[PDB]
UniProtKB/Swiss-Prot annotation:
Family note: Belongs to the haloalkane dehalogenase family. Type 2 subfamily.
pH dependence: Optimum pH is 8.2.
All copies of domain AB hydrolase-1, residue ranges: 28-152
Location(s) in or outside the cell: Periplasm
Protein name: Haloalkane dehalogenase
Gene induction: Constitutively expressed.
Native organism: Sphingobium indicum (strain DSM 16413 / CCM 7287 / MTCC 6362 / UT26 / NBRC 101211 / UT26S) (Sphingobium japonicum)
Length: 293
């Protein structure tokens, strides 16, 4: 379906208005999108968890219905800045101490890091196509390797700010089934205007911890990777076939993580658009196990 889940709420964070879905009651099930997506990514997955908790999906700053940072530029929307806003938002939402995180892409880097820093409050972690550790270019899927190298070059601004390549090329190219007009409209909406409106979708690929750069994100991801590899917190690994980012070495590494259940769904990177019911059913089952009666 193309219809969103629930309706957007807003809250002021560091003076900027952030958007989020917050439906239902009980301990949170916290769904975090990555690039270049929004809370809309989870719209067909969150229904599966009806009744099981407070279903929350925030729009990262500069994304979805969340405000843009102004003045924007190449120094804006780095990992650390997103983390500042998201940490503050999650604090404001009064999540309590039994949170289930459901994460993807940069939502996984942010949620894994948040989990490492707030481990006593994390009841379980479901993740898919995640940034589970620092990688090398050989680990990056071959189909888009050159494109992502170009993003991480001076060519990135034209590709993304001018031509909206992450929304219009990468996103559909990593979804196996055709998207509808309405579905694409929802993904393009935060990024209809050329220029800095699209900067989050360029800053993000520039932040991926690849070949040692940027070193701060490499350090952060090294930290949560080491922690996750030891943590007994229940995990749900939603593996994808063919998948894209969490394949090869990174998948090998994820498969080493303790207390983890794994399912495989059809999909490349944005697997929520290919297998939402399989993914939702798996998450709901995970949460029912974590929250018995």
């Amino acid at each position: 379906g193309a219809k969103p889940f629930g309706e957007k709420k807003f809250i002021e964070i560091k003076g900027r208005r952030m958007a989020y879905i917050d439906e239902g009651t009980g301990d949170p099930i916290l769904f975090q999108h990555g690039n270049p997506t929004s809370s809309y990514l989870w719209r067909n997955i969150m229904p599966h968890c009806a009744g099981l908790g407070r279903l929350i999906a925030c729009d990262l700053i500069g994304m979805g219905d969340s405000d843009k940072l102004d003045p924007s530029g190449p120094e804006r929307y780095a990992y650390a800045e997103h983390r500042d806003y998201l940490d503050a938002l999650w604090e404001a939402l009064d999540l309590g101490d039994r949170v289930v995180l459901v994460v993807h892409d940069w939502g996984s880097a942010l949620g894994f890091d948040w989990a490492r820093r707030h481990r006593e409050r994390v009841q379980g972690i479901a993740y898919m196509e995640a940034i589970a550790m620092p990688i090398e270019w050989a680990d990056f899927p071959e189909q888009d390797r050159d494109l992502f190298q170009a993003f991480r070059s001076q060519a990135g601004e034209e590709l993304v700010l001018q031509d909206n390549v992450f929304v219009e090329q990468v996103l559909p190219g990593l979804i196996l089934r055709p998207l509808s007009e309405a579905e694409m409209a929802a993904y393009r909406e935060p990024f209809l205007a050329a220029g800095e409106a699209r900067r989050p979708t360029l800053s993000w690929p520039r932040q991926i911890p690849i070949a040692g750069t940027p070193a701060d994100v490499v350090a952060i991801a090294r930290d949560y990777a080491g922690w996750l590899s030891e943590s007994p917190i229940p995990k749900l690994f939603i593996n994808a076939e063919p998948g894209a980012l969490t394949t090869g070495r990174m998948r090998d590494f994820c498969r080493t993580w303790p207390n983890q259940t794994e399912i495989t769904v059809a999909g490349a990177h944005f697997i929520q658009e290919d297998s939402p019911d399989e993914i939702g059913a798996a998450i709901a089952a995970f949460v029912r196990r974590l929250r018995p009666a």
